Design a protein around this ligand. Sequence first.
Ligand SMILES: [Mg+2]
Ligand SMILES: [Zn+2]
Ligand SMILES: [Zn+2]
Ligand SMILES: [Zn+2]
Ligand SMILES: [Zn+2]
Length: 601
Amino acid sequence: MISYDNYVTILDEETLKAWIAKLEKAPVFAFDTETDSLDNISANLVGLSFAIEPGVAAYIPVAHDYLDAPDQISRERALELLKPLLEDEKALKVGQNLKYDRGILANYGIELRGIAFDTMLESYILNSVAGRHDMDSLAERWLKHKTITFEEIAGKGKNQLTFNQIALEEAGRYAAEDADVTLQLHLKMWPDLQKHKGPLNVFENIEMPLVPVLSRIERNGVKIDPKVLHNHSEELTLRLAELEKKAHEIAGEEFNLSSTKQLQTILFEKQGIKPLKKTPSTSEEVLEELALDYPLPKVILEYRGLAKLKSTYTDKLPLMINPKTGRVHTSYHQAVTATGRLSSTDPNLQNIPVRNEEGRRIRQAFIAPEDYVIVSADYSQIELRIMAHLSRDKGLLTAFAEGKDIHRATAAEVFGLPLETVTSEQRRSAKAINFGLIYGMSAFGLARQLNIPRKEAQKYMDLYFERYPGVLEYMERTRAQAKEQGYVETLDGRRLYLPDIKSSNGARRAAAERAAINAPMQGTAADIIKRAMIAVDAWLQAEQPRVRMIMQVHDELVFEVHKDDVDAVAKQIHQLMENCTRLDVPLLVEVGSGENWDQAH
Ligand SMILES: [Mg+2]
Ligand SMILES: [Zn+2]
Ligand SMILES: [Zn+2]
Ligand SMILES: [Zn+2]
Ligand SMILES: [Zn+2]
């Protein structure tokens, strides 16, 4: 176990000051905060823990208020004595998910500096796919130590206690162990993170500096109009009713809009071909093939889609508005994706349909406050530009260089015809090839996206590789080093380990080869986006203009800018994004604005 003998519980100023003195001369120190809620903006700090050396850690309770809780240093007195140390950029701190801790302190007017090491990110940069990067998983992987779980001291279910309700000593065991373990994890991982300059570079200049900027974006939140979302909800109810009637009217009787049950009994029973369509799906959608002529499958297609969107965003979004700020605070995850891109939840901004009309209405609900406007800064087809650079292809490089539409430029080369005459179908064919290459799509998978026969798709890809030889080379070379060293890297050095590259399993090894071609372009896009965020945030902090960075979704950064400042600010965001990141890839940033996210998008 871990008893009350392990760590000290600081209940007096004199002892706290003794520790602050030791903390001041430590080379690095682990630090952690305890609160009464996972919600950063409204959580209250219940206590703090520190670790100066493996096995030497302490817990300082400041707001435990259960019946008869012992005297504790007051939250205000503890923070004023600790403030200088916390705000000192020279005092280096180590922590697990420091983004959270930085925010809690910000609730009390404290600016946490010296945010040097985050064990979550150390683990993530070492090997993004090694497993989960949370402390409990980390302590077990690297230290063969099983940590005290929050459930162990607080309980489970609705009757679960909040930190302020837990006994001082019990809270101490948990909090001081976090600090201690975090320091031990750093001592084991930091030395390893130096065996390679690639990962070390990404960790030091991309991931760590991004920690406080993610905190600031999350805490800023985004303005959502609940009325608009409600109208959209009422209207969708009516549209779902109408659509259901249109389905019944086309055939007979009533039925659910569920395939492999009520649909096959209608659809193919009235002429068609037996198999159904899985909601596997992004490759063989039987329902949308029939949709080009057959009416029923087209209405069932649209019905399901609207049903999904209503319960996911229309009904959910209004419930996420924080009472304290009046805004929605999404959760960004910095150590979850395999390629290094940021993910998002509650809400998952990336699942809002882009090329769909309803998704546009969801976006219209993201509004700018009075006298402000929503500004969108996007990296135009960054992955494609990255592939152009990685393949060193003069053809692609020149297309982007002279500002031509790469999809029409590619079609003009593949099909051999003037750029002005390329048709929509030809452009659509080249476009499917271009994005297919990024995901390492098979010549048959391209046929399923283009609806053309196999070997006809193969005919296009051979014509493509002949016109753009540099792309085949990159593809072959990347699969090469992937087998030679078990991993692939981005331009900045970020690595994706591929354990199934020599799998001996067929499909399992195919996946690893696709990931081999894909990761370098996706990871590089990710690195670029993170560098722009740090650069834009740095300008924001230094110059203090009337602008907030509110979102990050796909390849765009969304802001709130004062209406009278839009022009100067747009010039600035634009320069920072395509000139203060990587100077090797030919980058283009498209900046737009409006009353809501949809207008600026
Ligand atoms: Mg191309
Ligand atoms: Zn923590
Ligand atoms: Zn903790
Ligand atoms: Zn993208
Ligand atoms: Zn420019």
